[model samples]
Target: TLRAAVFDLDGVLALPAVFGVLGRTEEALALPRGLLNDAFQKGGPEGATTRLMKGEITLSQWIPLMEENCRKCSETAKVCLPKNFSIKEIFDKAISARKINRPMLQAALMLRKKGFTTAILTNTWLDDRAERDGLAQLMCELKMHFDFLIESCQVGMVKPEPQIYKFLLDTLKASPSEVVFLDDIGANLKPARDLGMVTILVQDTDTALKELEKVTGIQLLNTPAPLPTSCNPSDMSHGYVTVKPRVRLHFVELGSGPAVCLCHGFPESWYSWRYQIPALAQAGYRVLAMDMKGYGESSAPPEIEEYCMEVLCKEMVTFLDKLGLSQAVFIGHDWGGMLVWYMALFYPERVRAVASLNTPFIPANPNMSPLESIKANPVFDYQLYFQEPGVAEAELEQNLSRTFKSLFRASDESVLSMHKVCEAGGLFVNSPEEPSLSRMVTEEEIQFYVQQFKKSGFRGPLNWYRNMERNWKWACKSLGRKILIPALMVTAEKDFVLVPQMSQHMEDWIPHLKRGHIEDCGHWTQMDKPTEVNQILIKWLDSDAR
Candidate 1:
């Protein structure tokens, strides 16, 4: 049984204040995203950052070192920092954003209430006057939650050092086996593990709390863990607009004119419009790229029933109403593609026009369930696999980059329909050997998506698939309905899942329909053939003159 629980100060119990700050600072200074992290991470064993953490240097001394590093890094990367770039100003903003991790704090409080000792072990920097005052105030609040606070700066011993482990054990008067150390870094946990302590790496707060509960046999606060974000909040155009009391939507707005809202499909965000936004905006159209519910920075309602088609369409209209837009041209790809077509049917007055890529008008079958229709086809077995929550979230979230790389490609085999994702037990379990990046997306784009998903995990996105039956039943209501609005169905020649042949009868359901086709494209319609997709959209918009 665990008698004592030790938590890392900065990243575990207290938030990693620098994580999002790096991204925000880069945005403010007009430097590239992730550049600051790259520059600071180059600080090896003897570097200023490490030395500061080890208490060998004060914040004042470290500021100049950081300045030099940022300057050198920018020069190497061939990007100029803003003329008014100042590391001192950046830290001022960063220091102000520091706040307590309430979830972790609550857990620590409960551990002590259950007769277990809880302690904070931190490798801290020697702060300047203002910094010291602020940190002291923050520490006073944190002090109320735990039994002991062990500061490395005061003790002159940093983490990963065997002496620091010894110091922690001696201070607590606890044996290694009785103490469970929770830290954000693996290296910090290694020494504790070697000394016989059970160590939990705090990758995400929810996962960490679960591990902690298992080790200590103590129940923790099941509150939604704060989403870890890498993108600057300021960069999120129109940030978050509340659709309802508990529901908010994140979307990117650019240019000025008639709204051409872009909705992304499964496992994607507003970044899906990366190539199309500028093209459409330059062509004199306001581009509104959405992180549809459960994607990107949007609020994710937990229930599977909340993701049904009728509810999604209703919420989407609310999203538009919140922006004071009466109607707008809606365009979508993949699952997003399916949604816009439904929007045209359900909320026709609110949609000026509708365009879909890859996914076509899926006519409802009165005799068969949508889930049954999918399971009947061996190619569509992944839908059945994704119907259950936590299973796909576990597989997809385990290695995010791999999952994105596997799905974003243009090859037939890379698309879900071509894979035995369900028969092989899981999607990633029998994935292609070393799935290479598609020609359409850059490493930077992939990382941008990875960061977005890291904050809003796959659970919300998978919830969309979990509502197959509900969505199907909703579709059943509109069997005889035809989309009366100006609509366009864009098909991709090589799309394995929603084949181009699927669009052949789309005209039957959409009276005012026009069509566009991209040769040699896959399921990732717009991303796989961006230029063709953009041209089709712009040409149709110009012709329709909406």
Candidate 2:
């Protein structure tokens, strides 16, 4: 039984290195014949092997030394290895060329599920300048995927060096017999095997996982892997925790104190908390903003029942449990904000506190369909537009830029009178008009939404709306019971549906309720009034009273 698993980062944890300029090189290299990489394999300078891996030499020094060895083509700094370059650009090319290996990613997820302590031991570079280029954040985000990360530059020890393997074992607290290590390079695997540790060579993903499963006698990839989504791995600080082998939640994390999980609403990813993640983290709380299933890059099952509230709520429970978190403060916005409310109501054991933005906790009128409630009350008529499949999906897909522009923009009389406009003109389709920008949102933010929706169509996200009745049927049972947790409801004055009156009775049920109303903002509360929302939420989550 293997107690621990260790992986090489470059080719295993991330995509294999298909160097840009190096791809054009003909030099005899270890991996795919690259100039700079040729030197790191220990043939650069006189003492490059002993010194570079030991972190005795920095990138500035090492680059010149590497140029000395691979200087023939590098003199022009065109074909490969440059004496002058930005470390950030080096990795920018690296990341762009790499396609995340989904099966391997899933396999790593399963290793934790099987109780193997996992670690990454990689020979990498160090450049403080690269820190600002989002590389450090990427590392931190990817670091969340493993139990431990051992970088050669950080540890001053490189692979194939016996000391690094010993250092790895020491850090993992696992002896030789307890760990199995894998790498794309043979030299790295040799030291581990020499140390009486099992070693596997990685090449292709499918073959590699099958080999690993055979050695461990556990089915690693026995189940077929789910088709990969465009979920950016670096979006979530902690890479992923696998609850179902094929299903995992991608979450964005920030801050460092007690746990506060932020859930995003429909048509929103964890980036919905872009304004909140850092603010709450800076306020001294470890914040987790997740891409709810069927939204953002989270798993989107084609089955409608999979999106049911009970099942969706359970994902949060399992998510919290596997994340090594017990009870947490949950904050949700839009549908996500609505989720934190449900998390408190349904899985009270996982809730220490709850908060919502724009959305308020209201008991459903059991017999009324959400559409009927909206029609009878006539608020946020967009819900009716979204209720039918293909109607909104086709229209949104037709002009993504225009759709998000209208959706994210502030709602005024123009949007209020959208019912007539939609009826007369059939929603956004065939309109040929792009709506104006929202008061609070920038084109940069709206552009991000357009890129995501373009890759992941609105069909999956709209499924959240499709399940309102399903949510009602299951949730109507506990209607009268007050959400016993300490709660905060941050309402936006301009939000069309989640208005103040909708949650007027909230205090009657939630005795510990603390409510806030932000002015001059529309539906997107936090995004619209981040300072106020963050101040209110941070003050509430940090309060000693609750």
Candidate 3:
């Protein structure tokens, strides 16, 4: 039986063969025509490239060496190269060529699930400095998915060497016959075959996978991953829109004057701003609290990618366009808080200002997947479960009251922490009874939330979780994006998931950000501490950003 699986990186996991380094490198360096590839290959027992891979030289040290080679290519190729260039710029741009071979990645994940040992065997670079997009960094992004990552540099070994293969075999405790090896190059495959391992060549996706199933009876190709389930868009009281995005958005409006938009997060709607709507409207502002694309009466598309931040950011803008407001201060709570952050990034022109509650302006790390970036920490384990299709929806949707009460409690960190509030554990993990609410909520308020959920199934709300990866990818498009408009992050101290100081980094990117806090509150900041949350909003909205 096949006990372990080892695969190559460059041509397989990181495709375009050389992982697009040559072209990206060429573009970044503004090199003379045909200089990058030649310079890339020159200098080591192999040269600077090999030394760089072996972590023997830092990128700073290697750059001048490579530049020296670049000048050589310039003289020979007769193309003009920059007299002065930023080494870090070229290094960052060029190394990001590894577009994941998604299918291959999916196959590996599936095999990992099917009781097979998983590993990446690559004679890849091991950066001395922990660079963001380097091969070492790539492994970190992909680390959790695999049990072992056998890098050549660390082991002082390179592939096509019998010793490297032996190292992997010994580590996995599998005999050569029990291992299945896959690689793009023939020479890499030849050595494994000599050792009695079943080796597959990476000719192409279909041919390779076909050979894979033949060698091992496990089916790598299965049903395409599920898309989010469809839900009827609710038509609740609010500003309605049939925007270009093809879905209707229902927003609740209050006293009319200057526009103020309130976007509520998951398991919530425009009604979420009940406390703020009147306050803002009475304070000489036209209040528009929205269902934020996924929840309430807004259009909740079945596809996860439809909920991408850029798409949602545009949709919010479109919602404003229909409302005839050129710009408005946007306020969001929970995921809505997260959305306005992106709105400021993607469409800053449309935002007069932005405010968040119990949410931080957690910028996307381009190095990680959106879901991976958001749920990258242990605090977000529940999000990992949500990323899977139907997992959270199936569990939480079964009993809406329990789902709401279990999670929607006005204040209850004890249950959340005391029990595993996510995937396979506690109130979030199990269908437990209604828990006690915080003093902020009344008995009547309990029914209000439950009734709202009854009309709008958790599917629409859970769909937000489904889009984490898509959102991350969408967030990546805003890589160099910044929030220039005045920003405010109103934090909640009692909020467990998205803690207060988590947004402390906002000052770094948001040039005009103001931070505020509401103490003695839980996840339901707006509801639990409505008075404090509203005061913070009014004060920020009335500021210069207005």
lDDT of 2 at 318: 90
What would the per-residue lDDT of candidate 1 be over residues 1-546, giving only the tens digit for each residue? 689999987677766557668887877677777889877766676677778877888888888888888888888899998878787877776766777887888888778868998899988878884657767667865775577888887787788889999999999999999999999889889999999999999988889999989878777856433221123334545657888888889888876679998999998888877778766875678889898999877988788877888888999999888889999999998889989999999898999899998888878888988877897777687788887778888888988888888778766546344557777788766566567777767788788888998887888888888877778778888997889889888888887778888778877788778989899887777677677777899999988745
Top-TM-score structure, candidate number: 1
- Cα TM-score of candidate 3: 0.54
* Clash count list over all predictions: 0, 4, 5
lDDT of 2 by residue, 235-258 (tens): 546547666866778777765679
Per-residue lDDT of candidate 3, residues 313-374 (tens digit) = 87778788887779988888888888888888878888888888878876677665655454
For TM-score, candidate 1 versus 2, the one ahead is 1
Q: In lDDT terms, how accurate is model 1?
A: 0.81
**Is candidate 1 or 3 superior in lDDT?**
1
Pairwise TM-score winner, candidates 2 and 3: 2
Q: Which residue pairs collide in model 3, if any?
A: 43-47, 44-47, 238-251, 370-472, 425-429
Cα lDDT of model 3 overall? 0.71
As for candidate 2, its clashing pairs are 255-281, 257-286, 332-337, 333-337
